[model samples]
Target chain A: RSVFSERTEESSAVQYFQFYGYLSQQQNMMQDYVRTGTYQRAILQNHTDFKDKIVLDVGCGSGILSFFAAQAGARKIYAVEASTMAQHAEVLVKSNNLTDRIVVIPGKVEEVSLPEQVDIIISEPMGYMLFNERMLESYLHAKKYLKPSGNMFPTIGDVHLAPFTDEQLYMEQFTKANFWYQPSFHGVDLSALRGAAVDEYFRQPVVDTFDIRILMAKSVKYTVNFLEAKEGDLHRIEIPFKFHMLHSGLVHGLAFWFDVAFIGSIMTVWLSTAPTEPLTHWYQVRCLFQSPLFAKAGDTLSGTCLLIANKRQSYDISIVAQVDQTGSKSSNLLDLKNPFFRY
Target chain B: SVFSERTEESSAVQYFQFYGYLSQQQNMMQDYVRTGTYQRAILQNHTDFKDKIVLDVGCGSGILSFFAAQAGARKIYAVEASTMAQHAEVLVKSNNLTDRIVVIPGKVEEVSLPEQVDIIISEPMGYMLFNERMLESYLHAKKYLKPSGNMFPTIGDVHLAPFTDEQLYMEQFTKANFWYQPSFHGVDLSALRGAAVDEYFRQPVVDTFDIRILMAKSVKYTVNFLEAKEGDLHRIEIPFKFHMLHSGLVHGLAFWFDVAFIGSIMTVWLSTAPTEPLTHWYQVRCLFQSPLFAKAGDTLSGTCLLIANKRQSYDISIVAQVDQTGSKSSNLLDLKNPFFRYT
Candidate 1:
């Protein structure tokens, strides 16, 4: 592979890194709201101490990450951004008069030669469960050029989830051709999967979390290695899941939560934008079952899990779904996405 | 105010548990050596394990107490580490050996002598001496033993250094890792590199290691060793320094030198790399400094904090560096807390 180790110099990934500045401030408020719904006291101290360090903002869109670095007292910043967002980022940088501290590089990270090795590497390369976006690779590439003692921001990760019941995901569909033969016009009448679902279903959120900060808090290296995996690779993870309610619909989506380590133990928290989660953006990952089933109202559909990591080029995710309608040998009356069925 | 939750899972008094094992000097010594000191159990100018009133100090696991009881000692004053003593009580009852073994729970140095004894037997050796301070508490126990009683496994400072790779450590303290970038930045200047310097420690290291065990028995031990038998020591400088570079785990280790007592010998042979790569919580013992004193800047300069103690009388703990700077002082901290000592 001709490896061009560069990314959008002012990529949106960069702005995501800067978002931690706000999350840290939210914690004190959250901590206050934890029990008494009041501020305990202002132990609220600014901890974005990226002081005297050189930082590289791979994909520094909007120059948010660069601004954060400057505010963090970073001495020099290579804010790499691509796309027309580059122009907006440069303007923002000039408006802030951070021209001396931040060098806005308007290009893909793959082509630009960064001026200096960074003490810190920052980026907001995240997708759902930190896999969709391939920002981790760009971040790691930048890391290879960093000073030996320098560090990568967001040193660790934690994920969370929340649950809710819904019915829209399993709405019935009708097919019509010309007129007289509307009901029998079966050109496979498949809306991907038309007949599996029955009359009733329940939706519940297990391991409810709202921490996946849109794109800020994520594992760049982990996300990259997983997203770009080919077949065989290495991955290690622990799946911590909990059942919060009954499933009322075909599981339309999974709510995700995330946190990123900034410095020491400091972290940035984000409520999820998952469709399953109450958010203004992003729809749930709609899963169209090939043989979707009809679940009754009283039946409990536990939150299904499909965690994947430690693979090459791509993650290997396997999911299992179940139904409790069968009372006798109820030894798994139904199994969704069962490997056995695929085999 | 929130401190209450800190110790909620466990309390401070739990720390006193290890003290129970260290209660008696003799037992602590036995645990220190992982044996009953069978070769050196006989009293000088006396040769009887039968019908004798023997005193067993620091009876960690009570191997000696049972031995004395089986040897036909009329009565055994088995003072033990309190927690271990309680456990021993159960063992004593189960073995139907309670009549012969009297388990007293208190430090020999602090406990009042209820009565004198005919013979004294103990195993008193630490990780190269005084790492566990069993001797301090045991030394005072001698005041309660009978005149002409015996002290088993007497130790004198022992020293041996060979060019074997097993000797990847020095006696006192040594930094196992040091980087040299030459013109890049004059060594350890890795800090002068790009922002990814944290990766430096993760990088592959290639170098040599000169280490020593700094073998010695305290004459006036600042920290104590094992049961009874003390020479009222001093800040004994047991020059123990072996120099070695950063060799890969697969490439080196100098092992199986001998320590002799009564023509009998013990050797340290087979070794392996640490189970984990990072050196944070606990690291394998790697001594590189010698057993002698030197003014600052001679060779060793930086320091770190160290706390070495056996866990529940099974594992060995020998750490160096009381602070990150490399200098060392043995004022025990975690020893005063049980959670840290938790096996």
Candidate 2:
């Protein structure tokens, strides 16, 4: 009897809806010092941009960003949240005595209506690996309600990739898989399921924070300027990267992190979730290969990261890389595929 | 723009599948505090189980059923609503106890037994004791028990106490105060501090902590398993007035549970209290938006309500009032908002 035999897409949709509405989920985002602080500073520092202007905040859980814009002297702010947390945000706006300036709208940005075009649009829509939740499309679509010259809070997003060497982390996956390889566990045969269990373990990218020193090569960046990018561009993203090895090491996996920049009139604020920087809730994503590759300094590791968004806003990510070692006259090709979901 | 709604059947399927995984089973089995206590409770009370018919509700891997069989159970109906039931059957046959223990692959409420059971056993306690509402199913299974039958855990108590941990309070405050930074990235963030802290305190934290953090005498609200009706699981309201044992800043309240295995020969207790060894269900802490300063004799009075929603999760709220001696008479510390505890 298979437990997942009756699984349906609707079950995941329900989980997605419940996740955004949960207070714990909202707290996680708010507690991310780097993310929230950057958004706050970006809005208040450029008061001239927000002052006496009508602003729209997409997915404004608890309306914290809306409050920031209001404090920046915005004439009015529309905070749109799809989940039931919108009800709490409404209460928060009233309690903070900002009801006059902040309006908490309870619906998706796609369906919600605003009285007039906004001068600024702000949203923390970035997910793990930048496109895991496929929320950037929604953020881009909300641009229809912005003024001709209106600015987006995060004007640009850059996804960075690097090869990493962590023997312990790589071995841990096998340690977990070894449990299934046992001939008998409490008198139940599990040896036959070892392969499937190992496959399942590597089917999703691991979200964690590791020291940047683990990286074996220079990183590559792929940028998406929100002002210039169209929603259709998110359908399929392909970023080719060729990294030069920093040292001689066995590369176990590829690591990914993102940086979002808010370009203001006089200053630009960058929120980086890189391993070298302070950690954020959106920690770096690691996709381990079935087999590790050896490379020396000056060796080249080239790959194309392809991400395709599904109907439910999740993404199927593929990392195809070839490591060419110096003077070895040999190359190792590696292809890794994984599905990333919001839940 | 409507998200799909979760049906009762779909929710049940997901919930059951979650427990069916081998990792989940291994996790519970490795929880020595839980598994050892259940084993000892059953083995120590051999007279009660000798030649007795038993029913094990929500028996995942049939460990409890096997324990009963080892205690000389004449027959055991192991009702499990997950695919783990198949593994349990294999284990039972491998142990050569298939004739004594029958793995019933269905929910306890839907499964039918040939005759009434003399003893009923289940480990249905979830996080905070009532998180998953599995206790309701355990109670429903009482219909299959004989009039003079007994439940392994005859009583369960939820304990609460005010705590004062400066570090924990500051940790939460520091994350919230990030929104209050005056010149973070050259921007003012003072206005949104209140909402940030409010949002942070809206969800109870499930974690482990030392008992030294407690500042007041603990109070307990109990449930008599034999007397508690299915309707009684809907809401649990605990009204407490604790006299502060120490003069400190009260950050929040801590909750833990203890279930009693009352047998004819002996009574055993399994506790997840901070003073005891840790378990899978560590402890639930409901932090306040703002900490309260109290003298040693100050009284912290409040009504903590655990209201179960349709999804079988809880909406917990604490309406507290602090009464200090000498100067300030009483300061109402009503949280006003409900903290969620999802399954």
Candidate 3:
């Protein structure tokens, strides 16, 4: 026993605290790469560019990208990675007997040195929306190390948004989130945390896997061309759009996804992640509107989607909807922010 | 750019995480209250409580406190901090045990009992047993109880075993990848894979798992509720040697716990063990980067250390030594290499 209360500070409570760790999450990305085979197919079909070329595989997890480059007959390749995955990559490269051709460096591109400028750089670094991961800075840093005319694979990357209606999504979030307000615990009201609970929901961007048929509006909000991107570009992103309703429906949220283009002088490939397509690792980001909206088939609504990047792992997305009256816009705007998907 | 950092340790942020901690396990709390194991154990151990003074720490819903009163305790103090305390008062009144059981709506450490009690009771076990950081409360309360006084669930333990379940474990590990690949529709969202991985590492996995695939188990830590000194909570170490029962790949260690009551008339035992039926505590797993080949006759030995930090958190690590006389290689595992936070 202790003579003082200080011993209580070291109490060993069960570790039931919530943490969204990386491996269980990162493992899925690798599976997506293998199952979808989009990256593999694109890199395989474009073997011409890799033949006898010096290449760089940025963020080379599992060394698959580097493997693809080696399979394409790259001469000397640098596989730069910054995780425990790097250790696995070393084993993989050794197993494939490409140890001489592929060198795995366990560090960030910004910190690691590439022996010489390479002819091409291949990387899969897109986040929800698109820029949330912020790996492009590393990609760009490595870009400077590439030959003047060399290209960044999946040439263009950008995020797009569309209006969607997912009543099921909202209902589940609300029900699971505000249980503290649901009736009383015996005779006491436990509603004190209802506000905090709602705010907590707003702090997280819901990532879900579902069919793409739920989109209710037509139009993309914005795109970021990583090739021409600047460090300061993400500070404030304004995406203005007019929502041309395809049918009279109840709108509950905004849906977000991203695109990558494998461009070349010989051929170009586009990988679009829309709800209507087959599921991929980057399923989709959905942010519910505080209140559902009702509109007619021909109703036209306009708004500006604002993205303010935070220092945390995500961006703060907001929408200021402009009310329409007799073909004119009114100032009755319903604004929502933060948990909104900001690519 | 990169995500932001906390300029100050704001309670708002802490409250956000703490709020999540409370409601996320609502089902678990309900499960504990509904389970017959604890109730049956208390009732069976009632003889020890007869004509005695008792204190219940974290008396949620006053269930255990009521049990002590039912056992004919002279007096019982039920301590609770959440809104659920109000409901506990109602339950005590309804049960007509109000005169015997006094609901003290505060932490047991901060409150002063009218008199020293004969026994102390608390269901403070979190997932993996010590995750909730509640051991300090019970230890501090122990000082208030008489030397002859007994503690319910007299013995507590944490156990670890080598385990492998390829299908189910891999599914969870790679769920993120399956969600995103090539593109969501036509967009590249692989950027999230990185952030997702980072998040996954920070979070602990909680779920019921079949233990038939477990190779061998070792009791990692133990505490006799009545006799464990406060000093026992710090820097405790346990040695483990496992002989694989099956020739399979070892992905990670499976963790659970056991709590037993030693009494005059009858003894009751409870466990969060994998072989036992799953409880809300379920099982905690620490995944390795890649599965290590383990043979039925091979021996896997390690030493695990549990550091009870002053912040009421635990620093746990396992350094394993692999002797594969017939397998690929013989190597010493970094049993003390990687430290995981349990809180």
Candidate 4:
């Protein structure tokens, strides 16, 4: 049971509405200072003091940090936001009367122009596990506006992956209601698998990475242009991890982190779960799979991850992870979702 | 319950994408014309048409001209907008009808049908109204009619009604819901989506036009391309007499009765009803109004009746009726709706 159906050229208009209906909530989520110290820590980690220097904030949702820099004694702060938390942020800035101190240019950082180079470029632009939203591209653009010695927040972080088990139970409950009636799911009539394998784990690659230092500082911005993925490919997934806190999130579930560094002290009490956390909002995502290799006890899987850009903030990544498998001699990884798949 | 893609689960049947379904039909119509199958029927059915003066407007595929020749028309003006005129010549010379039927390759609106004719014929019904306006051309043809002459499928009626079946309504609801986009749907239903989320059959009709045919055997379906005005809704409906011929249909037949003013006999032709557990042509285009910006709590009422059905060896005719109880009065000329701009 849904609603009335519509068939008309306006269907496009209607579809657009439905699509809008889906995302408005997310945009609203990005607006508030759900937590305060998230982004501030990432900025301070990159720069010792904000007093008297210029700074840039990319994808500057709410201009919270821009106003911060202005109050922190920065002479000029250029801030940019891309619609996500736009309205509430704009209203807050306007109410605080920091509109003149913090120039809120509403657009993607890549397209916005600053009159002069800045000593620091800071952005909290990462989605869950790095690559999901691909917001890191905003920070790269800051380079064009960055002075030679300009410092980037949480300079760099490494993207890592860990293998675990616990997806079967997750998917079971996720799709439970649909499977409840008439012993059916997706159209096929089926009786529930009471004790059968519930760990139907699926494979997903994390390609992006966020600065690791943000973890100690309390905020982290995560963004990743996958190591090698075609346009429009999905960059995020929720797999079950039995070791996770069973009720909310299982430990065995994929736990992603970005470690950022600071000059004086990594005083940054970094947060890893995105958005709601400061700078930790983005996970430096590097979501590409080179091989179907599996990792096991004491088995070393190592690789050098590099950030390569085409022109400014828009970039791609390259990684070569050589996994030392324990049970299997082959380096080719086995796809978790495929029981019948062979390559 | 979403009917639009219900069959998609089959994996074997050819699922139609937007343009493919329509393009295939147009291609089929072209095929029907070229095979000469269409001509045989006319000549066989009307034995005394030989040596008669004829007018053929929108004579696509030219089979009509060849048929006119087979009927022995002394002079046949075959007016076709497409290159069907040139093909008609080859078909004429090949079929040896050259001397009798002259192929006029041009839009009927632009071409004169030579001299007034003793008869006129065309097949112009599209998915709904205004699909192919052979009717407009036929009207021009009527101006040149011999006063007592006929038009094939001479008279047509547009019928519509309310259906109360649970399944059809549920399917429509599921589809619109499938169209749900949590984010941008707030933007108004047009800007974000492209495909329709629902079906057309079970929708309640707020208004239905019972347009009657002219005496000369042609359709008059020119919609005023003006925007919907408040007062316009009042003039669009004023419930009337409809001896509906349901026979065995879930919804009343909002029918089109084509009175074939063929030669000396005038007969009716119907593009069958969908509610009769059978589907042929499209369900009648039900133009609905919102009855004062329809909102929750407003009640709408109407009856679905299969009033009457009369059929014979070569023809069928039906009648139906509907009246809206309440809702928002909306825009009238929705060039935005496919029901208006299928072409």
Candidate 5:
């Protein structure tokens, strides 16, 4: 019997922290003003909720959130981080003169020991598309240590979706896939690989930013309430939607963005990563259809998005959508499925 | 046996198809500057290749091997890791060069050859000169070469110069500067502008730009193929000093490369610098978060380090400092900025 098989889960968790342990990775998240600033104000402005209260800060990279909580007069804070970043957080706590108030714990939230239940639990557990890293599972696990009436920052998170049209982006993908269709290149034939090339180019979601004007209709959203969500609820997420085209020439794909709200007793702070708002590290994720659909204003597009968690802590996204012209029957326009890796 | 395990390896078929794509092969073949230079270097130095045995590492499409055959080589071994090796065999047979050229389909590290060769040729350069790490394989193939054998690219040099491009810098900055706004949803986040700049500039950009944007003279680090050991590819450090040619705000450093083919008859040089014709490997730009002002005759010095990472990519770090002559006597820059260059 090999120990390697038994250590798979432990290895994966270790690798996850190894990745997040890099300063570069932390910098990207901390630099997202919309994310860090929103959390800062959410904790600092709500002194009534934090003053003299015990708090839990999960995945505290560099302990920035713990510092904010300390500034808000929190009596005690347990900052739990799986990565070696916990060491950095300890140094930061001492440097900021909050070592007495803030305790840096180095271990998974699920494995770490806390002295008692807390009055508040705060964490930035959202990943790209709201479920990329599968970190919400850990966040949910931390809930077991919270008091019955304990509050949670970012009580709700909404993932917004909308149809979009971008001729340039679609053409770039097409051009890349078309390369395999060439009959001969320097005495070599590559036509056999055309199908795989097409699949390769269209299957992976493009993680990039696009103009807000590219959207063709009003967006629909799926909300997840952190305090109410169960671990099993994250295993499979499905969202059904129908949108009437406001203006459209060619429907290229669907775009997704997310916003999380930190609703405290004193105030509420929301962080939005929408294209219409200031850009963040998580810009926007676009899933391109295999084939573009042409439609006019008032035409309807309906679909169900199924996101399944995989063993790698990523999601396998399956989107099945159809387009209906105003005076014509609905037809299947998109049926795409692919894994979105967090690494 | 109470255990389970899983393993993964690179898909050989997909990797081959990536290079087998005719458009991809065409892209490299159509680069007149690259293809023509290799052709001229071999054909013009027929005296050196005539009646000699040759080996072409990474012989995609067997173009280089074919060139050697045309140059009167007695025997040529064309090794390719992609399926394109099969097509190369077809080409060799059709061109009646089968008697001279042999197409071997496998990695050079694992492949075995019957006899030593007098000359080794390869087109192994990637973006920023060392990306893709193909040179490692090319170097490994040296085991099959005779003690006195020569490599096609006898020497390769990577050059860096300080550049000032307001338009390009502004375009990159504006995207990150979005968070510098007065307020978002009544929250002040103008303080995160520095972090935003730091994150955006951490990744080096691969693009083509005008050579006139360069404000100072370039310094170069050379790689001598015959003299370099395999371990040398793991890390490279080059110290450089540049004298400013004009007054401008230095935004970043520009990188380019050139290779020399020294033959018995003549030497041929192929350059992918901003001053030369563009190739697939356009110049790489490493932008700075803060631009520094330099007067004419000012001196700028730096050390560039390229360390190979596990992903077969390079982690590049630059430590730069400047000295001004005029009234603006200031410590312009002294930052150890790291950038990642992917294959």
Candidate 6:
């Protein structure tokens, strides 16, 4: 899923967006955010509340959201963007003639300063896999800017999981893992790398899109109610869910996504990154098993989704599955963990 | 070119980071061994390699060296600059081919060999056939290879074809375009699209696709590694012309490549054509400023200027004429422009 790997004994590795600034690399996410009326309508629907109110836009790449708040009659908006995109945001705000209402500040939220507490904080920090770059942490850090009665734009994000069947996905993994086992690739014994390659692919969670119909049994893994989520929730956690299979099929892996809700006083807008819905840039996270498991139509499947904070600050996601097979009349258990995945 | 902002440090940063991926020996090995083409070209076609001395430039996993050893090569030198050389060492020793293959843990430019080599084998192609800038390294190291010697991939080329994938093009930029809508919350964010333009031009996209090509791919540049010199890579420009084949949108040009291992009596070629199965090196797609809808009898023409900088980076641009009724419209994308800088 990640293109770059750490080469040195660095304290913190770079995020995926680090290769290209998020603004340049994640145009899809930007397009999704602006085109989807989800956020704009949520803020505008509460225009009366935004009128003359102070708003804090965290991680404002191009100040699109801040401009939205300003357009909604916000008296003043402080847009904080940590990357080079802040410069672009500043120019954008100026060109929009909203410079009087919006101020663009370039620095990490944890490192920036605010003139005073605001009534609202808005940001789009969710990354692929929902937890890779924990922008949620920054939103939590920016909670200080919120007035006592102020609300977080996205007050809730619930992570979800489901069993999925993907023939191509399974075949690709099988071939990659077993590629080295070929008796003779030009008379060379590549079997030495069979285990390493398999482990490598297996340890990396695939951040790709899949067919929604592939998901059979589904459940909610965890929910982050930003208004009340604790620091402990950001660290190691586990969510166990039992599922009743909808149909008989091979369970290749579990797909993960989140349904984020923009809660306002007058309205609430939802952005569901579930495969069944139109995809956002975050797409879905595929946690493949080393070996596939088969289940029957009336079988029971139970599993625990474990998300552990790695040394680099990002979460390393894994799953433990217990499947009851009626077709073969057998039981199977699986433990899958990705390697170091730093935010 | 209006956004031209090419800093020496930033260009060098790009190069170091690119090879950084290539240096990841295990990653490269996984793809090389799995594809089977590299080994096939080296071992199956070169029956007389048993008595040859083979040199592998940028040898990450030492797979080529292993292939040569299997091909009955008397001595093989596998040179790599990354820790992968260490992995290659382990793989070679484990396969008991260490006696025949020497794993040199250093860049090919700085590494020393006892004698001239008979054949040089390396899989150095990157996205779009040029991203990693390894061709120079191979050209520089060929001095260690004899005049009559063979190159595993003796020739490599960059190919460009006109393509139309309206949905993908729209998906890539529609949201950003929406931000520039005439009236968004009563504000003209349209100026923001200028930054978007810069961002788009600054980064060349690598996307996997199956779209209709407007014209047959034309060879942009071909490198005869056996005869190419380091200076020959410095600055080059390739002009192209395409007559439309069908009525569709012209979104951009699709780039892949062809690599061939040529021996005196045999040759093996690998094509990364649009129809061909993808490898680790995905196709390079250059999106257009606007999708040009053309008729089946229309024409698409363009010129791509590629300049190889001393920093081991590239400054590339494409100027195309997209017209429907012989009227001229220009769509230009230049990555060297600083305005296009994303990160």
Ranking by lDDT: 2, 5, 6, 3, 4, 1
What C-alpha lDDT, on a 0 to 100 scale, does residue B78 get in candidate 4? 84
Docking class of 3: incorrect
Worst 10 residues of 5 chain A by lDDT: A328-337
Once fitted onto the true fold, the runs of candidate 4 whose alpha carbons sit more than 4 angstroms away are A1-343, B1-41, B44-48, B128-131, B178-238, B241-262, B265-271, B274-280, B285-343
lDDT (C-alpha, whole model) for all candidates: 0.39, 0.78, 0.64, 0.40, 0.76, 0.68
Error of 6 at A312 (Å): 6.4
- Tens digits of per-residue lDDT for model 6, A258-296: 888887777777878887787666667777777777887
Model 6 agreement with the true structure over B1-343: per-residue lDDT tens digits: 1001222434444443434332244455556533477777766766648688889897766767777776789999898876556667867877888678888877677778889998888877766666556777787788888877887788988888777776656654654575567665455667667666556545566656654454544546788888888667666577776667777777777777888888655787888776777666667767666666667667666677767654345677676775455533334444332221111
TM-score of 5: 0.68
Model 2: per-residue Cα lDDT over B158-277, one tens digit each: 999988877766776777776666554333445556655666666577788878889997999999998887679777888999899898888888889999999998999999998899
Can you write out model 3's per-residue Cα lDDT over B1-343, one digit (the tens) per residue? 0001211223223322442343443554457523456666767878888889988987765667767776778899888755556656765775667789898876565677888888898887865676645665777688679878888878888888877867644654465464346434232435445444433432445666666768775556788878776567656677777887888887667778888877788888888787777676777776554566777888877676666543344566655656764332121222211223223
Off by over 4 Å in 3: A1-27, A33-36, A186-188, A326-343, B1-22, B25-27, B32-124, B128-222, B230-278, B283-343
Residues B1-343 of candidate 5 have per-residue lDDT tens digits of: 0001101122232234467644466579779899889998999989778999999998887778888987999999999877777767766775678789999988787678889999999998987788766677778788888998999988899999989988767875676565566433332335555555655566677778877899987898899998887668878888877899988888878889999999999999999998888787778888766677887888877677887654444777776767553222111121122233324
Superior candidate under DockQ, 1 versus 4: 4
| CA error at residue B93 for candidate 3, angstroms | 21
- Docking quality of model 4: it rates as incorrect
Q: Give the Cα error of residue B336 in candidate 6, in Å.
A: 10
For candidate 3, the per-residue lDDT at A342 reads: 27
Point to the candidate with the largest TM-score: 2
Better of 1 and 6 by lDDT: 6
Kindly provide the TM-score obtained by chain B of candidate 6 when compared with the true chain B: 0.82
User: Interface RMSD values for the candidates, listed in order?
Assistant: 27.6, 5.5, 11.3, 20.5, 8.6, 5.2
DockQ scores for all the models shown? 0.00, 0.12, 0.09, 0.02, 0.08, 0.22
For model 2, what fraction of the real interface contacts is kept? 0.08
